Amino acid sequence: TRRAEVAGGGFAGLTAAIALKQNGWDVRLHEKSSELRAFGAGIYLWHNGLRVLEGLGALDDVLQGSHTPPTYETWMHNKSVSKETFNGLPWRIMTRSHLHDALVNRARALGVDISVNSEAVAADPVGRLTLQTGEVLEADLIVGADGVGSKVRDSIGFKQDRWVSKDGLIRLIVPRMKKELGHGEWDNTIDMWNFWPRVQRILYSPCNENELYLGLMAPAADPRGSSVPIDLEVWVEMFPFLEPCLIEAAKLKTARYDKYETTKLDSWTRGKVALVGDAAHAMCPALAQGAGCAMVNAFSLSQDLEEGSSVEDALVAWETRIRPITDRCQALSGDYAANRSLSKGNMFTPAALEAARYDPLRRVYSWPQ
Ligand SMILES: Cc1cc2nc3c(=O)[nH]c(=O)nc-3n(C[C@H](O)[C@H](O)[C@H](O)COP(=O)(O)OP(=O)(O)OC[C@H]3O[C@@H](n4cnc5c(N)ncnc54)[C@H](O)[C@@H]3O)c2cc1C
Numbered sequence: 001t002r003r004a005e006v007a008g009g010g011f012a013g014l015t016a017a018i019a020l021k022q023n024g025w026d027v028r029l030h031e032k033s034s035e036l037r038a039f040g041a042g043i044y045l046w047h048n049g050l051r052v053l054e055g056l057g058a059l060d061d062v063l064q065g066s067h068t069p070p071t072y073e074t075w076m077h078n079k080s081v082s083k084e085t086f087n088g089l090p091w092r093i094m095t096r097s098h099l100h101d102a103l104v105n106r107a108r109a110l111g112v113d114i115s116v117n118s119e120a121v122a123a124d125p126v127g128r129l130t131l132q133t134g135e136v137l138e139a140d141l142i143v144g145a146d147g148v149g150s151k152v153r154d155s156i157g158f159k160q161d162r163w164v165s166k167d168g169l170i171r172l173i174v175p176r177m178k179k180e181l182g183h184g185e186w187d188n189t190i191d192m193w194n195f196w197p198r199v200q201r202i203l204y205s206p207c208n209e210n211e212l213y214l215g216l217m218a219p220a221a222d223p224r225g226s227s228v229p230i231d232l233e234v235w236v237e238m239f240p241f242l243e244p245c246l247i248e249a250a251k252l253k254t255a256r257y258d259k260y261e262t263t264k265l266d267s268w269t270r271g272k273v274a275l276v277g278d279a280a281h282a283m284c285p286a287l288a289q290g291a292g293c294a295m296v297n298a299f300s301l302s303q304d305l306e307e308g309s310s311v312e313d314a315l316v317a318w319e320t321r322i323r324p325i326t327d328r329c330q331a332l333s334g335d336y337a338a339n340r341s342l343s344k345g346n347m348f349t350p351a352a353l354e355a356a357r358y359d360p361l362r363r364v365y366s367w368p369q
């Protein structure tokens, strides 16, 4: 009976744990936090990620209570510039905790051993995981899913391309306030861009009949637009049609202005150690594939470990097989971000939807564009 130690309780670690447990592995997941939770307010999942949920036996709990907008619409200075539906390509919007809970309940129903207040501080390719307390654990597989700043990764030393975004955003969950919004298509995802009179953007994303996921984006150099709690006035001014929701968002005293970083490594494996999720490939959010690829990769890792080969060879086989999809997605998303391509609309092209089109279960590309 094989034993795996997963460091990190995020979407990647939870995905890895569940997939491994389903294949007969004895698995223990380590979460440094005192409780299992997810941050970031809301999240978009596509066909590729939805398929992972199916393979994990956690799709039903996710679909129930999540939302698929009639269309993905883009605005530039309040003028609708595009409405995209991706030719039937499945996608979904939900609060992060809704997705996190589905994964945690499944992990528990499976008998995955989850340890809170357990922080991994080092990993040995020979198959050993060291915790912050000094306690050393041995296993046949060590999974580094501890996000950006991954101690598992840095304890081993990987060649890393790092970049940090100077600009960030404020992500919040507020009431739909649908009736107060009056006439409109308020069930759609609406990416509201603006460069004049100021650079302010709001990604409007309904999660269900009760919750709305908002992303208020302004330059870090904007003292008003980047402030938290939100400077109500500055947002209502350029997004008056959302005052009802903005008024509610202004009451959230814990809102935060988050920046992000991207990560590209020369490799994702070392001996019996495999890096997954942000720890291995954090990317720009343009294509909304950060978690999608993380879940695909974590799930794919379990598949390669079912070939009858050594864990070491399975890991290199895993990277070689699945990595290209993430590299291209990460590269394209970076290009979109730098050129602000999404502001033009109709940018979810076949190339952009490549990762989303991938079906990890059958290991083929579906929903052609
Ligand atoms: C602004 C923004 C918007 C985004 N929108 C989307 C989207 O719409 N759709 C999408 O798919 N992706 C999106 N992403 C990307 C997505 O958030 C990430 O790819 C994903 O959540 C991270 O996966 P993870 O589980 O590896 O990381 P984490 O999310 O942080 O995994 C690590 C977890 O392990 C714990 N941990 C950390 N260190 C240790 C340690 N040393 N020992 C034990 N535990 C530890 C932490 O508590 C943490 O929760 C977005 C990213 C940004 C920045």
Ligand SMILES: Cc1ncc(C(=O)O)cc1O
Binding pocket: 044, 203, 215, 285, 286, 287, 288, 342
């Ligand atoms: C879902 C999503 N899409 C695009 C961005 C971006 O910052 O360009 C952020 C998102 O959460």
